[PDB]
Symmetry: C3
Subunit: 676 residues, 3 copies
């Protein structure tokens, strides 16, 4: 009985082969069903691919159903084959082929389908538009599931239309011609563009017409390899959220935002020929967690300076926990902006295209309040000599109202005699740093202890100083007369800060005793000397001599020729000294260039507690002993204060290169313009 034959043949383990199937959707349009809900198997969407197959079910009355070439296939007879597919569509359902094929139309059909799209692979496209509240796109990774713009395509790889709201873009890549490290770009391309809204609807969230409320999430999306912008959110769009956005390898601007009312979290922008980020006309937005690196990337060819971040014509921005680092020009340029609030801000090792040239934050006609600032320049710290920022802050105008608090100078050792702020440009702007009172702006009454002048002849001699010192004469300093200023105050455990303008006359071999605590140099001298030593060949050494706590230590270094002090040039010379903490700084007041070193922890043999036992007195231009070395040149504006960190010292230099450090800690301040 051939009946048993058929059952046994169909019942073989490969028996499914005997059930015919549709070869293609083209074949499917010619296959009329004879039963409602009739089941058919589709081998593949397009002949020869083995891609896009599935199961379809029939509506003999295909009325109100439209063929879309993927999930709704209509017959010549008017029936509709409907893909059995509850949830997301993917491009292969609509004829995508992957590989080098142009899958633009299949991908466009997905996001137009009325369902969210799943990217299961990498698809080449030219330009895709997201139009509906169903146009979500989901992948499974930042790389392998992605849209890839064709090399010939220009414009926006993805455009979010002003009719599209409340979608999710999650965990997929958006790659352009330059996606791979060190490759070139197709001109005029953008990864994701959010167009300016052309209208406002009254039926949100069911709107079908233009509306500014994007109210959508771009989450774990990786944009790489575009020319003009990675992501460009144009004016008029509200509530475009980004979350874990990663932007790599952009010829020009990583991310541009020109709109209001949005929040981004954990954004990273890396390696852009121009800015990593442009905020232009932004307001009432939030960035929380941000990393902006390798802006103004030189191999991307852009001659010309561009900062890591431009904040232009913006207001009411709260920007917390971001870092700008390794950018070729300035770190952050704030221009014509109001009320920029930054809480936890890290800017270090920018200006990498030209050493000692650019600044980490550049203020121009802007107001800002910046808290939790940090900026440890790891190139200066390591001593690598790599190009880095001249300093932290630069004011291009003096109508800025700016408050800055944090660690303005980090306080590492200074192997190459530099740190975070190596050129300081003071300003008359309405500026407050670290809550420090600006001496030029205070009427506070303070102590002002009077030192005793001492010399072989005890009559002070006064001589001219350069006009940069802001006075006519200063105290004549000579080795022959041992000119010095003796304070009777002794150093205590709170520590001390000592500073003066010194105009050194540098000729032959010589020891300059700029300032001292106590005298002598031995296990029990309880003394500090800051010295400039010139050997007979002109080599210059800055030496800190410490004696106490049962031992002696020399912390000195030979200056490279380009950092040597110049005869007749005024320098602000400052030290902070306290148990376990010594720093010195020499500041050229005509160029603003600074050298410095700082000693804590393992650099100190002992904390030298006994220097601060209220027994060693303070002396300027020599030590407290009649035989000590003195100085050659001129002194002025001698300052004694209680201990200030180098952080606060540098902060106060932005007010003025030669003024007292901290009015609330001021103990003595002597101009020395023909008086003591």
């Amino acid at each position: 009985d051939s009946f048993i034959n058929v059952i046994n043949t169909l019942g073989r383990n490969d028996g499914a082969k005997y059930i015919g199937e549709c070869h293609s959707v083209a074949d499917l349009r010619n296959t009329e069903p004879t039963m409602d809900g009739q089941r058919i198997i589709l081998k593949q969407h397009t002949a020869g691919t083995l891609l896009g197959g599935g199961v379809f079910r029939a509506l003999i009355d295909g009325t109100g159903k439209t063929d879309n070439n993927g999930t709704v296939i209509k017959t010549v007879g008017g029936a509709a084959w409907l893909r059995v597919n509850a949830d997301r569509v993917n491009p292969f359902m609509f004829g995508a082929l992957g590989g080098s094929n142009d899958d633009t139309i299949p991908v466009q059909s997905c996001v137009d389908s009325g369902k969210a799209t799943q990217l299961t692979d990498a698809h080449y496209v030219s330009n895709i538009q997201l139009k509906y509240n169903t146009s979500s796109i989901y992948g499974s990774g930042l790389h392998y599931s992605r849209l890839h713009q064709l090399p010939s395509a220009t414009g926006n790889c993805i455009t979010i239309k002003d009719t599209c709201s409340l979608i999710v873009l999650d965990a997929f890549g958006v790659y352009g011609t330059g996606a791979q490290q060190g490759t070139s770009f197709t001109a005029g391309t953008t990864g994701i563009y959010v167009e300016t809204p052309s209208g406002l609807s009254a039926d949100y969230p069911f709107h079908t017409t233009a509306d500014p409320r994007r109210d959508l999430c771009i989450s774990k999306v990786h944009i790489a390899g575009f020319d003009e912008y990675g992501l460009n959110i144009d004016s008029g769009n509200f509530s475009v959220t980004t979350d874990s956005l990663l932007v790599n390898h952009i010829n020009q601007v990583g991310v541009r935002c020109a709109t209001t009312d949005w929040t981004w979290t954990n954004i990273q922008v890396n390696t852009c020929g121009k800015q990593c980020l442009v905020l232009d006309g932004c307001g009432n937005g939030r960035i929380i967690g941000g990393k902006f690196i390798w802006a103004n990337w030189q191999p991307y060819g852009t001659v010309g300076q561009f900062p890591g971040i431009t904040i232009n014509n913006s207001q009411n921005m709260v920007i917390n926990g971001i870092e700008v680092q390794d950018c070729g020009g300035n770190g952050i340029e704030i221009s014509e902006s109001y009320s920029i609030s930054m809480n936890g801000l890290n800017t270090n090792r920018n200006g990498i295209n030209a050493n000692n040239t650019f600044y980490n934050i550049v203020f121009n006609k802007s107001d800002a309040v910046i808290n939790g600032f940090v900026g440890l320049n790891y190139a200066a710290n390591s001593g690598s000599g790599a190009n880095s920022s001249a300093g932290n802050f630069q004011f291009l105008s003096n109508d800025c109202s700016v408050t800055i608090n944090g660690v303005v100078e980090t306080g590492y050792m200074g192997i190459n005699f530099i740190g975070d702020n190596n050129i300081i440009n003071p300003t008359n702007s309405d500026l407050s740093i670290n809550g420090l009172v600006n001496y030029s702006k205070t009427g506070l009454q303070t102590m002002n202890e009077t030192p005793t002048f001492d010399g072989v002849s005890t009559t002070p001699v006064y001589v001219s100083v350069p006009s940069s010192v802001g006075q006519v004469n200063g105290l004549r300093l000579s080795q022959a007369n041992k000119d010095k200023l003796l304070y009777s105050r002794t150093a205590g455990p709170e520590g001390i800060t000592m500073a003066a303008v010194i105009v050194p006359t540098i000729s032959g071999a010589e020891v300059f005793n700029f300032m001292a605590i106590g005298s002598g140099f031995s296990d029990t001298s309880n003394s500090l000397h800051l010295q400039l030593v010139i050997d007979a060949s002109g080599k210059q050494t800055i030496a800190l001599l410490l004696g106490g706590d049962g031992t002696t230590q020399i912390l000195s270094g030979d200056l490279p020729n380009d950092l040597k002090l110049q005869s007749g040039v005024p320098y602000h010379i400052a030290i902070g000294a306290k148990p376990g903490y010594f720093w010195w700084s020499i500041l050229n007041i005509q160029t603003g260039k600074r050298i410095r070193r700082s000693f804590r922890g393992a650099y100190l043999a002992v904390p030298f507690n006994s220097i601060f036992g209220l027994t060693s007195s303070l002396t300027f231009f020599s030590d407290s002993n009649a035989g000590g070395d003195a100085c050659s040149g001129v002194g002025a504006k001698v300052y004694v204060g209680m201990f200030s960190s180098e952080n606060d010292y540098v902060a106060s230099r932005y007010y003025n290169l030669i003024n007292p450090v901290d009015p609330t800690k001021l103990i003595s301040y002597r101009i020395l313009d023909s008086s003591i």
Copy 2:
């Protein structure tokens, strides 16, 4: 041979039609398998739908298996048909129909199934309960994949039970009757409710009994259109995380939290009839990135004031990077709360239901530390006249301990003579703003330069002032005697701040010279005059006259009648003047109402550097020239300080309307109570 006929018939491209299938799960329960793992095709869950079909496999011994009407279907004979389904379930598997159908039971079966639920569409429900660590729900968008509460249903659309922990709610909508803009609500509804735990388990995370550790994520979820609450997290629940939560169109309170120990990131709450957010009994929580807008939304009918945010009976809250904007009443009300820490805070343009009536932050028996404050009132800036906040801060009690730092007054031009703080209510609370020393609380010794009184007769005349001025008499100001105060101090590039109480006598046409720098008015006069001009018709003009840097400029405006100065009323009149930066403020000390303007950037023809060349002296009530115009009325409490921004000026007004601006910058302060 009919064998070939069968193979050729089955082998047609539509051959799958010949394989029978089950019409419904009801039919399936009557279909006994004869082989283990036997495969059957289910056409659809419910007859007539074409929805919920799939492939099932048989367990002849359905023992320990329970029929659930979707993925486990048991036969009369005791066998179990198991849906071939590795991962998530969706409501259509359990009989959902979508459209207008009540899909409550299918959706409840999904979240009770033991698998996570995928929402592929919009489903109407009455009330759903999440009970298990498997009760996750995933959608593909904030709108199209959603639960939709039936119009007749009341109560919670979703309840998270105290047995439910460690689930994810990701990328779907939760809509109620009022979801669409401008529609009404069903009474007593809540979007998502997290119930108060009834117990604590000892076997987390495998607990099957009540526990407070929710430890779950609500992520990219959109809640819209509910009455009482969008999201309501009740007391006793720990670690309910929200991430990119979006709440729209709530009749009453957008989000209520009444518990401890949680973190939210990037929350937005928009358009609520009462508060956007209520924190009531909260502690040890974090909000990072928040947008709270259109609270107290008038068309939602709630008569009565409700703030954008209520912080009540809470403690140890860290709230970073949030904004409160466009709310109908106060911005933020902090009541009976300890240790509220805010870092990066934006409050602007609230109080929109009644102009000049509400305040951006209202403190009542609370302590707070607020850093990075900003609040550019875009309505005042644009000059639209839209209703906006009276000012930034209001203290309902004087037992608050509050620190505020930031841009308290933004410093835009003031087209309508107003800005951010238009009514100032000073307080005796333990308050510190912008690190400013409160003059009423300091013993610091400062400079106090003595001006020279000048007049046609050089003997000062003193007359009564209103008691609000805090002294018996002031300096008689007259045009006939040209009463004035001449300081010999000249203005420098750091700038200057000048202020006084002036009680003007306003009668006919007249020029009041409130204060001046230098004298004359020409390309090279290096002068500033602040003037009140009254024309013969009573119209009042506030004019800033600047001469220097080779040109002259008039920055004046006619006051609207409601802003005119009133004869016999005391005003605090203050200016800040420095190169490129001029602001003036007139403050009615009896009503706290302020008018003001500020000039920087393009409003200035030149920076007027030469006004600040240390050649132009300071004068109150006239200028330094014998022929200058003077004033009519009384003067008192003359203040000279180094430059303060309007930001710091306004900040210090919260201490006291008439005291010195900044003790650390004070140069002169003359009461003028029968002395100079």
Copy 3:
């Protein structure tokens, strides 16, 4: 006709049973296709499971295809069966069995497949390695979809190899032996390990070789029950993002990070035997939103102290919105670190393994700027007597540069006479708290009002004080002579702060009037008295007596014996008094132990406005009335300032236990070393 028989038999609703299928992939390898793209049904991967089945399609020419035991199955004949599977793979496709089975090889095949992996259930594994940019893993919950390390397995449950970048790990669990509350661990296990990179590639993101750019997201992942680490990110890895990471039940360290350049948001680490978090050698990273609780968890057996967070050898860290709470030892230990920036920081109720022993933040050779600090100790507030931190801050070295701002002492009532800072260890470090000038470091000139000494005999008597008071003698205080200091200053609405060193002689029953405002005690006395009352049995009472605003109130408490004042011991005794706000503090200057109470809100019958009407004078050691009670012992270092919160009082104690509170508010300071 047996043809009709076959059609009718196949057409039965169970007709699918007649289509044969493959019993196993082993059977499949022996099934040669005869048509390209031939369809076959696979019943199951492994015989007897009903797991892993599906549909496969044939490539007769299996060339360039490799058998992987799940989705690519090759025949003896060289053909390839390809699983119809567009998107993610799951372990059951590769032979996983779930339950107690070791599914390591199936799971490893998934993440090696070239597709992302979906976890649909809980799978036991030993060790899994993520190697490719396709090795993403997705679950549907933090618990039920998970990897579970076998009890015998050691090492890393998941290792991310240095070839793996740009993947997502989303919404699944990683459990070890100790996952369930209160269970033990397998030695040497780690949840997720990110290995140190062995090289750098030049073709990112298409690299196939080692690279430091992880650039991956760990999102909504739950790690529980491992020994050494929950998550361990080793040196050299960049941009490992965590987002909503939840770590529970770790024998040792919840999370270790030893690398640079990363951002975490909303991390929670709960219940670790050692630290919740170790940052060791970190730099240029961000943590935004963090909860670290129950570190140093005693039942996990680690004898020895470990902080909630170790920050060691790190720099340029921005850590915003975190909380450390309920940890067994110190809260946060910062060692050998630069530029640690914290904005919004909550540390409370740590040190729970030994009461009054540990500190919330411990600084050692580190610099930090901390803003928005809060730390309401809920155990002290509730009066539970549970073990809690001795105090907020401890400095193990004096070379730290630290700025702290916030609510250093919360200001709740003090039911057990304690609060947040119960032992205070002052430091000579470069420290600034709440912007307070350190009196030891200021040269500012202030008022110093001179009191009038009064006694039955009006000649002051001076007697010795302990050396801890920093002077030789103080003012002899006796009840017989009514020794007192009368200021003529009266209290005003701004309030007042009064403090002194008092060395009490405690013998029999006695009333000590430490200090007073006004005199008398009645509805209209407008008076304040701070009293120590000793009854005849030695019981001690600290009483605040308030009279005014029409009533009287006693705010007193009996001290527990262990908190009693000791005869001959010096105490710093301070009050702040203003309308509606009264606090007192008694500080043992030899042990640093403090007791205190604070009265606001409901504790006050009235605000006692009339005490501050400028009519009641200030008195030390008695009141302004000749008959008032006085003191027995010695007084020294009498301080009058304008009102300071207890917050600022405690903050200033970290500078020095006995110095003036606030130099900018200082009104009087009398050493009393043989003078008045």
